[PDB]
Amino acid sequence: MSGSHHHHHHSSGIEGRGRMKKKQIEFENELRSMLATALEKDISQEERNALNIAEKALDNSEYLPKIILNLRKALTPLAINRTLNHDLSELYKFITSSKASNKNLGGGLIMSWGRLF
């Protein structure tokens, strides 16, 4: 059958076991599928570098605020310098407006990096 039989056991894994202890399953699925699509999109050395750093930290459990900060710290100066490929502009809009918002999703003073505050 040629329909959805190939759709079984997604590479972008989704569970609520001991990654932290709990989490958001649907929003993590939504973001990590979009970022997996964003790797399959044509990205240059620097944009690839940020999203490869993203994979290794995501699966090392180095935190959702920390990695939302990481993409907003890595992609915002490249946006201002006008060299981001911009073909995942919706991902940049996503971590500021979807459920995760402005700062990250929780707020708080990060210190040091206040170029856009």
From Swiss-Prot:
GO terms for biological process: bacteriocin immunity. Keywords: Bacteriocin immunity, Plasmid. Pfam families: EntA_Immun (PF08951). InterPro entries: LciA_Immunity-like. Disulfide bonds: none annotated. Imparts immunity to lactococcin-A to naturally sensitive host strains. This is Lactococcin-A immunity protein. It comes from Lactococcus lactis subsp. lactis.
